[model samples]
Target: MLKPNVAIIVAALKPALGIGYKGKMPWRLRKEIRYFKDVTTRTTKPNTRNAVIMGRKTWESIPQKFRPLPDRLNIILSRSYENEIIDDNIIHASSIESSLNLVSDVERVFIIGGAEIYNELINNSLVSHLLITEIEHPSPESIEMDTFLKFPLESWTKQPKSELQKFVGDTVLEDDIKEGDFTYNYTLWTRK
Candidate 1:
């Protein structure tokens, strides 16, 4: 079988798996956001760039100033839209599989998503790695009303620190970075 050469990235609250509140990420981790941008933008070579596949809602969730993430090919998945015109940097795919197929030429591909997109790729065994920002929720009660997205955990195994070093390269793993009155860790998971 042709395995997908894709990595999944997300930030979710631990224990509850709440990734977003309304349309935005529940927490504001500037460091995590910077790390995300670095990962999505970094490529193996000077001229090449990574491809970032995201759901329509995820695409919309990004602030207008950052749409079509810089230095990466932005592919938006949407079954409802057809022949929609977007910037030269953006393209729409009907499904995750189609999105993967569309970016075959790209050196690296990352799945940055809104819950459903991540779930679909994971359930289908299409994700190669999961770069998760595990946030510790303040109070269990506080998450009840805000919890909307859940990251699938059953099929993934947390990668060892030594193994994680292989993928991260020179970028420092800002583990346990604190922001927005909460603490979080940048963790890497691989399908088992």
Candidate 2:
């Protein structure tokens, strides 16, 4: 059987999972971005690379010029007509089930976001680990927009430690923790 694990990375209000807006991250938190880059890259090693599963919008939000992040397998979920301009590193799957089926045997899979994708996965109990970067303040506009990704605490087991380990060359763990002007903390949640 495939040990399917959908790793989620999010930043949000204390009790709300407010991840983003209008195809961009709603907050102006540089540390949050750095922390995300750090933890997601941690899974890469000599022979293993992490795979990212994202909704079409999430894939599009990636700055076109530098996207299809190198060294990682980018799997995009979309029901739209396939675009030839899409990066070579990216593969478009017809549906979540198809995407999961295609990568069922992989060692680690990271589910990068866009609100709808996360909701579908969590609601269906398809995700395993949710690596959340909890920001201190809630953007009132985000809540009103309703595009924010929300997760119920009752469905998850929160791991208090952050995934922002300081390390040399993405392997050796380091202690260089820095918080941005906005307050935030990285956390990992697993299914109980």
Candidate 3:
């Protein structure tokens, strides 16, 4: 059997699974930011960097103060941006196929995004694993007309973390968050 090596990581609210609120994540902190870097960095194979593929909007969303993330490769998926903004470690791809093709040999590819990028992955059945950070609260307001994936938990295998990495906050193994207005838990899921 062949296993697709593609993976996506998202932190959102449970039930609601809200990833963004008005073009931004619900919560942001130095610890969570560091945790994001650490987990994704550790997940990459040694001696090789992982690829982070995101839409143009996602690219723009990156705080100008942190415009370029150093270390790993950044592949910006954009249909616009004719003037390719070159960085020492960034590359731009105009299409999904071209984007994936750019990192076909990579040990792992991370689909980092602004929704549309994720929808594209789900639509093509290209995503094999999902690392989700589930939050407990539900936001009444939703991003309208934004692209999303209708992936059901039944369609995948969920694995709980033996212990939440202290640096990354409350990451539970094999279950949902049971407390707090917006409690969070990190999870890993793969297609069945």
Best by TM-score: 1
TM-score preference between candidates 1 and 2, better one: 1
Cα RMSD (angstroms) for every candidate in the order listed: 2.6, 4.4, 5.2
TM per prediction? 0.86, 0.75, 0.73
Error of 2 at 95 (Å): 2.7
Q: What is the number of backbone collisions in each predicted candidate, taken in the order shown? A: 0, 4, 4
Model 2 residue 62 CA deviation (Å) reads 2.2
Q: Each candidate: what lDDT?
A: 0.74, 0.62, 0.62
Q: What would the per-residue lDDT of candidate 3 be over residues 1-192, giving only the tens digit for each residue?
A: 134466787766556555665777755534445556765555334567666778889888888888666666787877764424366467787865565554533556678777777756754566777877766555535423233345666778876464234322443233443443445667777677
Tell me how far the alpha carbon of residue 35 in candidate 1 is from the true structure, in angstroms, after superposition.
0.6
At residue 67, candidate 2 shows an lDDT of: 80
Q: Comparing 1 and 3 by TM-score, which wins?
A: 1
Q: What's the residue-level lDDT of 188 in candidate 1?
A: 85
Q: How well does candidate 1 match the true structure in TM-score terms?
A: 0.86
- Candidate 3 whole-model C-alpha lDDT, 0 to 1: 0.62
